[PDB]
Design a protein around this nucleic acid. Structure first.
Lengths: 91, 98, 178, 689, 98
RNA sequence: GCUCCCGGCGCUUCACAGGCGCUGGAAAAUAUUUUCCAGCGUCUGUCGAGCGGAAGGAGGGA
């Protein structure tokens, strides 16, 4: 549901209001090198939202999205079986 | 998953879905067993109060010269009586005896 | 810095060195990577083999005049055998100072020294456990190191006789024939 | 109404074009591509009989892999009257001397072998490029970067220009990777790497004649749903493997060689532990991808592999580590078997129970694959079906092979139609699930598939390239296609009429895989049209661009004898030399490569090495070099390492350790260099040392 | 009521030098449609040319010199019998006459 | 066992290109809009370098 640039909007809502610019902090880098999961934190005055992503890119983006809509809110046991009606679709 | 053709022997007018299985599944009906096994594949059963059928499997061999000697356990072989809902099985117009 | 328990090794060997780099070359296995100031022991062992063989042959020729030349050459081959050198090296605890970085070689040396301790440092029958050539080669290397440091075949002979006295005495009473 | 095959019009046209001017022939894989090679081989056979000393010449057929070399050697042997030789690293070519190479070339008219063998052949002055009438390159798309084909082509820039051989490139696909965009520059670079332009069939009748041996099989898509939820037993096994990794990180095996990253910034775990970690990670991947039954087969494969490694282990600590790994694998297998057995309450008929548990304990990918396999080979003739299954990972081949064995001996209709078989590339996997010390089965998987004993092949990109396989009606690409050449060549594998090409992709990646296939097809069309409209009178690249293509790398070194030391071969030669120096089993130590720090680099090289990387190499203690040869300041680490190896080899040659051919001196040359001074008196008695 | 296509049969029987190279893998190229298998009676020109070219190319691949008779003999009516069976059937005819 | 080669995938760090978001400065127009410039952060793409798993190939050597 993050259709656009959430952190551009985040900086927008912050420093229209003469609020301090959003600070970004890279907290943890966990996992194997081929599956590293990165943790970016965003702090804006007393509010801080967490960002998890497979890359620092998407982690920071999602952290800023959390900051952004938080700024607005607060002003099996079984593999599923497959049907047999499958066909060979031409490509 | 067993797509082999089979032969229908008799149809049971008195029988109908939602009827209790005669052996080992008295608490299990044909209708609910069919759902619990292939509901995502069949969706639903239509014509629920009509008759059903009884089918028997055909041999897959094509050479009948040598005697098929073995301990078949004929009673155990006949134990698995197969009762099928008609509209869930594809029906040929081909006679079975032929 | 390379030489730890220096006095221990010098006391067991029976020689005190004036120039320690010969000892470093003697104890340097080719697999040891961090020694970049002096070559391995193969050069030293090449000379030491001939020196030890000649000295042993000279002693057995001078003293063992009773036995026939066939027994003399059998005794010579037995005294300079790599197995005998390995037992002598283990008995004097010279394997503690070998500079090597091979896991398989270290395990082989440990197994052989355990087996030797099981026999009480006694030369058994030509020994079911493999014998590493490293012990014999390093022993020959320190022999050549003594020779090069002292430049005196008499002192080298004193060292070799001090090392070989039990084996010399035992092998002069019975000849190991295989 | 005849048996012998006559050359076609397009083949004759290609041969006539090749004889006057060199180039690359781009034809679909099959009999035409090798027939044209045989024809151009025959056309350059004027000077085969005459010896080299009398102005004779030879023909060189250099391949990519040993099996393709043997294959083409047998083909040319059985199709031509020439006598051909087979020269690969398995023949022990390294210890071959001057005289017995000379009689070897004297014997055979055509030399067939791998690229590296002929590269070291030429670089050691065993033959000259003037001594080869024509050279044949098949699978020329491999000749990029530092591949031996490109080094062999680089050798052409040093030898005499007026006495160069004829270069011919055989390929079924021109592009190797995914650089499908901007075809023109890629094709120009490929043509510049060799010394000719690409030629292909143009007339409609020519295309139709080509069509008689190639095929465009129908390609179809088999969608299966993709789900993310996982079983609890998978979580338990993952936790067990994580705990075992924690325990193994402090296993404390004996001292091991230091392993580092490819560019030497970052440290590595010891190779022995990395092997175990790789095996368990591969097993985890297969468990996540194919299902619980697949994990049950893969854990048996891991049991066999760990048992083999423990048997081959030499140290007690290594045996203990492998015993712990085997204990984990047995525990995992027991857990998987327990999970499988908690379904038998459904019925008692085991024949259908096996099929039902297989279909219930596999991901929708495997279930759809099995349904497609059943509906495609329901009740057909085993002699009539011949199909390949392509998967990515090596262990996926074995796992799917075992699962397919069980499924085949689980369903009545597929019981007597399909005989599965599998093979993988180098670092072969044990094809046995019981870890028996020795088996009496000797027929190779590819030989069984060729002979018709097995009709179902599960291969991992091995059969995409090189090996000849009879025309296959069905080709199942179970794993997603990754490269353009893989797609093209797997599509060309289904070479029979009306053949079926099957793609297995999940629902969420349907758009992306359709777009990828569309880009592949459009790349093929641009290749065709670029080869179509382009016209050139010179039809050969000029000298200036050929020189500019190769000047980026380090200039090679040649001595007065003509031997050439290729900088890309310098590291191989140096490691070869460090191999013959030790005189003991435990005396092997490879050179220590060290990357100099900023302060060290400044202190050594002044202000002339800012922004550049330098590599210092420490030769082992035994060797004569103890001067810590320093590489020149280069842009990246790989060039620095190559320069360091090159300087080390040059300084070794100046020291006489290379016998004026940049191959390490053997004992015989060392004693021959001393016979004339120490054994001079032997001559009067008719003997030499 | 069914047999191989007429054209390929004519090529197979009327060419002894060409009959030793047709194998099971070559027969896979003969995938005729409904029209060819039902009304036409023989493979089309393109299919015939492709099959002939594949059979010719058999002589240069790894299949050269192979013996495909054991798997393609039944197509043309040939069969291989041991000489012992021939002697034994002569003796069996003698025995029944006796 | 070691070394090398080819390709693809995933992340990390540098350079370039464009967009966005605004702060400030200069200008025009009627607190408002527009134009130019600087700064910060980001979004999209490209070029380098590095890390990691996976596939294939070769060679030397026992």
């Amino acid at each position: 549901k993050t259709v656009g640039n959430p952190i551009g909007w985040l900086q927008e809502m912050c420093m229209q209001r003469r609020w301090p610019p959003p600070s970004y902090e890279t907290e943890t880098e966990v996992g194997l090198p081929h599956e590293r999961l990165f943790t970016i934190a965003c702090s804006i005055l007393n509010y801080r939202e967490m960002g998890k992503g497979k890359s620092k890119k998407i982690a920071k983006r999602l952290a800023a999205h959390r900051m952004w809509m938080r700024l607005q809110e607060t002003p099996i046991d079984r593999y599923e079986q497959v049907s047999k009606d499958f066909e060979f679709i031409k490509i | 998953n067993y797509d082999k053709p089979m032969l229908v022997t008799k149809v049971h007018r008195e029988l109908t879905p939602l009827s209790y299985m005669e052996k080992n599944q008295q608490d299990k009906t044909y209708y609910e067993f069919t759902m619990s096994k292939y509901g995502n594949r069949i969706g639903d059963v239509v014509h629920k109060d009509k008759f059903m059928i009884e089918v028997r499997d055909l041999t897959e061999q094509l050479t009948f010269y040598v005697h098929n000697r073995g301990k078949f356990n004929a009673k155990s072989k006949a134990k698995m009586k197969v009762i099928l809902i008609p509209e869930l099985c594809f029906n040929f117009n081909f006679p079975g005896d032929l | 810095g390379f030489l730890i328990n220096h006095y221990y090794l010098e006391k067991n060997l029976g020689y005190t060195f004036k120039d320690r780099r010969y000892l470093l070359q003697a104890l340097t296995h080719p697999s040891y990577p961090t020694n970049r100031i002096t070559g391995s022991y193969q050069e030293l062992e090449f000379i030491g083999n001939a020196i030890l063989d000649f000295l042993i042959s000279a002693y057995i020729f001078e003293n063992n005049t009773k036995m026939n030349p066939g027994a003399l050459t059998d005794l010579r081959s037995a005294l300079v055998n790599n197995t005998t050198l390995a037992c002598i090296c283990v008995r004097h605890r010279l394997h503690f100072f070998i500079l090597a970085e091979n896991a398989k070689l270290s395990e082989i040396i440990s197994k052989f020294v355990n087996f030797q301790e099981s026999q009480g440092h006694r030369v058994t029958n030509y020994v079911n456990v493999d014998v590493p050539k490293a012990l014999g080669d390093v022993l020959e290397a320190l022999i050549a190191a003594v020779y090069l440091d002292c430049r005196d075949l008499q002192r080298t002979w004193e060292v070799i006789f001090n090392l070989f006295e039990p084996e010399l005495q035992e092998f002069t009473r019975k000849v190991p024939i295989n | 109404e005849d048996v012998e095959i006559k050359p076609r019009g397009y083949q004759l046209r290609l041969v006539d074009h090749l004889t006057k001017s060199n180039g690359i022939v781009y034809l679909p894989t099959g009999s035409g591509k090798t027939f044209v090679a045989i024809l151009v081989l025959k056309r350059f056979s004027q000077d085969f009989d005459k010896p080299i000393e009398s102005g004779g010449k030879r023909a060189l057929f250099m391949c990519n892999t040993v099996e393709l070399a043997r294959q083409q050697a047998m083909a040319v042997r059985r199709c031509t009257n020439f006598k051909v030789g087979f020269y690969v690293g398995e023949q022990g070519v390294d210890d071959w001397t001057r005289g017995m190479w000379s009689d070897e070339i004297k014997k055979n008219q055509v030399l067939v072998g791998t690229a590296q063998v002929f590269l070291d052949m030429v670089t050691q002055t065993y033959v000259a490029l003037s001594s080869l009438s024509v050279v044949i390159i098949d699978e020329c798309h491999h000749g990029t970067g530092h591949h031996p084909f490109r080094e062999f082509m680089r050798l052409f820039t040093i030898a005499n220009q007026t006495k160069l051989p004829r270069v011919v490139g055989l390929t079924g696909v021109l592009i190797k990777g995914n650089e499908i965009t901007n075809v023109a520059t890629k094709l120009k670079e490929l043509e510049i790497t060799y010394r000719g332009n690409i030629i292909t069939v143009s007339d409609t009748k020519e295309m139709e004649n080509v069509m008689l041996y190639a095929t465009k099989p129908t390609e179809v898509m088999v969608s299966f749903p993709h789900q993310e939820q996982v079983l609890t037993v998978t979580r338990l096994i993952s936790a067990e493997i994580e705990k075992f990794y924690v325990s193994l990180d402090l296993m404390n095996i004996g001292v091991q060689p230091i392993r580092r990253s490819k560019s030497l910034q970052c440290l590595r775990d010891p190779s022995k532990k990395s092997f175990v970690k790789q095996l368990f990670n591969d097993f985890l991947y297969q468990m996540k991808e194919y299902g619980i039954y697949a994990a049950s087969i893969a854990i048996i494969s891991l049991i066999v592999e760990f048992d083999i490694k423990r048997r081959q282990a030499e140290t007690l600590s290594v045996k203990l580590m492998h015993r712990t790994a085997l204990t984990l694998c047995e525990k995992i297998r027991h857990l998987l078997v327990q999970k499988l057995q908690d379904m038998t309450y459904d019925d008692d008929d085991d024949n259908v129970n096996t099929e039902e548990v297989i279909m219930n304990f596999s991901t929708p990918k495997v279930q759809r694959f099995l349904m497609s396999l059943k509906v495609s080979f329901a009740d057909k003739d085993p002699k009539d079906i011949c199909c390949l299954v392509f998967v990515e990972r090596r262990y996926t081949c074995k796992c799917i092979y075992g699962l397919l064995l069980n499924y085949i001996q689980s369903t009545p209709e597929l019981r007597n139609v399909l005989t599965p078989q599998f093979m993988v590339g180098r670092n072969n996997i044990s094809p046995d699930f019981e870890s028996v010390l020795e088996r009496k089965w000797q027929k190779s998987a590819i030989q069984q598939f060729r002979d018709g004993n097995a009709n179902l092949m599960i291969c991992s990109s091995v059969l995409e390239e090189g090996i000849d396989v009879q025309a296959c009606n069905h080709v199942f690409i179970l794993d997603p296609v990754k490269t353009f050449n893989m797609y093209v060549q797997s599509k060309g594998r289904a070479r029979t009429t009306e053949a079926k090409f099957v793609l297995f992709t999940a629902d969420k990646e349907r758009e992306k895989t359709i777009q990828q296939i569309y880009q592949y097809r459009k790349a093929h069309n641009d290749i065709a049209e670029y080869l179509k409209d382009r016209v050139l009178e010179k039809t050969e690249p000029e000298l200036y661009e050929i020189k500019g293509h190769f000047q980026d790398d380090i200039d090679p070194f040649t001595n007065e004898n003509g031997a050439v030391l290729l900088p890309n071969n310098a590291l191989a030669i140096l490691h070869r030399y460090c191999q013959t120096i030790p005189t003991d089993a435990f005396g092997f130590v490879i050179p220590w490569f060290h990357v100099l720090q900023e302060d060290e680099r400044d202190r050594i090289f002044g202000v002339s090495a800012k922004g550049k990387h330098v590599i210092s190499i420490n030769m082992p203690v035994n060797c004569m070099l103890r001067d810590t040869i320093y590489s020149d300041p280069m842009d990246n680490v790989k060039t620095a390492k190559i320069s360091a190896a090159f300087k080390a080899c040059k300084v070794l040659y100046s020291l006489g350790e290379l016998n004026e051919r940049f191959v390490p001196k053997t004992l015989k040359e060392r004693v021959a260099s001393i016979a004339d001074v120490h054994f001079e008196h032997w001559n009067k008695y008719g003997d030499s040392v | 009521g069914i047999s191989l296509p007429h054209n390929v049969l004519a090529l197979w029987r009327e060419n002894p030098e060409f009959a030793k190279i047709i194998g099971p893998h070559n027969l896979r190229d003969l995938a005729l449609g409904d029209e060819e298998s039902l009304v036409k009676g023989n493979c089309s020109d393109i299919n015939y040319n492709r099959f002939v070219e594949g059979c010719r190319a058999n002589g240069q691949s790894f299949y050269a010199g192979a013996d495909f008779s054991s798997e393609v003999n039944f197509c043309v009516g040939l069969v291989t019998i041991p000489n012992k069976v021939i002697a034994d059937t002569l003796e069996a005819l003698l025995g029944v006459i006796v």
